[model samples]
Target: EPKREVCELNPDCDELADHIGFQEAYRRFYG
Candidate 1:
């Protein structure tokens, strides 16, 4: 699993989500 340190430091889930395109990327990844 990836580390949470950066996310914790950033304290902005939306920006992090956008950074990796989490939602869309997950779709593509799982599809």
Candidate 2:
């Protein structure tokens, strides 16, 4: 969950999610 916190603090996880084809998962959860 550290990654999520970091991403929430910044935007790196969203970037990584886009890079790994996890946009759906990201959007489902993060969105």
Candidate 3:
């Protein structure tokens, strides 16, 4: 299983989902 440290850090689902969406945008922008 992937280490969901972000999920761990941001226990709130709404915040975690937002963080994940931001990460996806970051990847597309810089990955």
Candidate 4:
């Protein structure tokens, strides 16, 4: 699986999430 953008709510974040920045992650998670 590809890495996902990070957010303030993911538990698997440390394993699969990339801290691309909150702005980009926000759009992906919310929008």
Query: Cα lDDT of model 3 overall?
Result: 0.45
Number of the top candidate by TM-score? 4
lDDT of 4 by residue, 1-31 (tens): 1324344466534422355655565556556
lDDT of 4: 0.48
**What is the alpha-carbon lDDT of model 1 when measured against the actual structure?**
0.45
Model 2 / residue 15 / CA error / Å: 0.3
Off by over 4 Å in 4: 1-18
Best of the two (1, 2) by lDDT: 2
| Of candidates 4 and 2, the better by lDDT | 2
- TM-scores, one per candidate: 0.31, 0.32, 0.32, 0.39
Name the TM-score of candidate 2: 0.32
Candidate 1 segments whose C-alpha is farther than 4 A from its true place: 1-20
Find the candidate with the highest lDDT and give its number.
Answer: 2
How many steric overlaps does candidate 4 have? 0
- Lowest summed-lDDT stretch of 10 residues in model 4? 1-10
lDDT of 1 by residue, 1-31 (tens): 2334333334454355566755544444343
RMSD of each predicted structure: 7.4, 7.4, 6.1, 8.3
lDDT of 2 at 6: 44
Model 1 CA lDDT for position 12: 54
For candidate 2, the per-residue lDDT at 1 reads: 58
Better of 1 and 4 by lDDT: 4
